[PDB]
Design a protein around this nucleic acid. Sequence first.
DNA 1: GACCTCCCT
DNA 2: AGGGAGGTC
Length: 581
Amino acid sequence: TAKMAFTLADRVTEEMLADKAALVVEVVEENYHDAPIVGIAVVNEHGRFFLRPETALADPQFVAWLGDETKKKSMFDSKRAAVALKWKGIELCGVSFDLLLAAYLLDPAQGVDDVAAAAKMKQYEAVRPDEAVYGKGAKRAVPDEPVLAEHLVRKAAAIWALERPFLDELRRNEQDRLLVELEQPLSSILAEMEFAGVKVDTKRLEQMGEELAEQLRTVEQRIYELAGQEFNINSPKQLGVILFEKLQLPVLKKSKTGYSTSADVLEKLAPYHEIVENILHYRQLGKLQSTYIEGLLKVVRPDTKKVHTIFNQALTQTGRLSSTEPNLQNIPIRLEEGRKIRQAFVPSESDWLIFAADYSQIELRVLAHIAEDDNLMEAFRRDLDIHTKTAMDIFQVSEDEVTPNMRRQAKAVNFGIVYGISDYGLAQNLNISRKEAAEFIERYFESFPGVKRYMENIVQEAKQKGYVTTLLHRRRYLPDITSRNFNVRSFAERMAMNTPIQGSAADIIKKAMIDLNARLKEERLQARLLLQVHDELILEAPKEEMERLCRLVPEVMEQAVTLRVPLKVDYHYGSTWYDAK
DNA sequence: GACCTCCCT
DNA sequence: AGGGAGGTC
């Protein structure tokens, strides 16, 4: 039942500082920013050691071992440790293997988020799930030293044992370089971006809040004035009663528990009553208020007026990053009212500016490359407007004859083609029939027979191999590709179509980040990566570096990989993120 | 805490 | 196609 052998050290010794080791720097708080490090474990050829962080991190030897690149560490989720240590003024170097990132690449669907889950992949179970040790939610606590220490040593021991088999399988999948040269170096770069953070103009945000608060009072009362009664507009029950009982509005869609009040459904009810337009407007504002003024203000650090996101680099099934606390990959841009929120994200130093660079149509360009569709590749070699070109082709008209509605619909098809494309899926999106939506898809394929071929071929490959891959050898297993349930098989077919596109795009932007970081250092620029939003990079830099960045950044991003079509990068800069358009 | 719309790329 | 993050039992 019990205890693995280890030295509960009272001070740091030399044999703890070997040049190969499994290391655990445990930060139990979910948000690791400026968070406590609760204990340390080291396992190496000389044994297993638990150290107290107050001891270890006050020790010159240990700190210098941490920062020594030639001293190789094996860890789980090294970025967590790295950041927590940065907030304490200590550099972590020499991380040559990260089990979290290794597990993520081997199979992203396992949802590996702790050492235990990773260990299980190789029939190793001599370690506990963090959830069992720390608890979950309100009962979540750091346990007493003997339980804590044994757990960190078991995790370190698991890392030590598991490196070789993980690396072995990564190599067999041709994923070794993907780990060592892309994801691991990216992890350090993300660490720097998170630590640096983004400066927020809180005063600006707060006055926006106030404008909104007063706009919401007005609409809220107008809504009660129109419903002839007061009610909870946010309630699914109360509103559905006002809409579909008291006002007799027609029921166009019924959800699981009742009537749908989604924006798509409401937009269609607006002609019937003046209440509907005010409810939409109320929700748009309420969204900005709750999610983007209030939400953001509670995560700004009052000391520096910065937000420090955490990028989850081991979550998405596609190889994309996610962003949390705050999520800075969903800041409004589409609607001008919401876009103004970006005026609150400002450079962290005076006389600095925000620089934003974004790939133009990277997904469709990746598709052109992997499908080798002659027409699509030509379209991009001509740097055509792709939605216009797709319109001309599916409706068989000249540039002159393409109407704005034709272009809107071709665009929707382009998106749908990217996401796997179903007559029913597009039909819903375009507010039209499943037949006829099928006519569009069919028509598209007549113009892009290479894309059609790719779609068919990749689904067959998914079935044959059990998975699909990206440009840089990221893998996604698709076991549902064989189910006899149409809906479940279909979704897996869509993932088979989409994942090489979206995943290859993720691959390219990650390499660009790595390449950009190396060029920034080589050039001695003070410019720093602040954020990544799937197909764009956001930096801040002195005004005096703008001109050099205008050349340097797009170029690095464009040259990250060489495809059969060119990659294209647009860029802008300004006093705020908003103005960097 | 666990089941059930709207913002982004 | 991927994500993150108020009412209600």
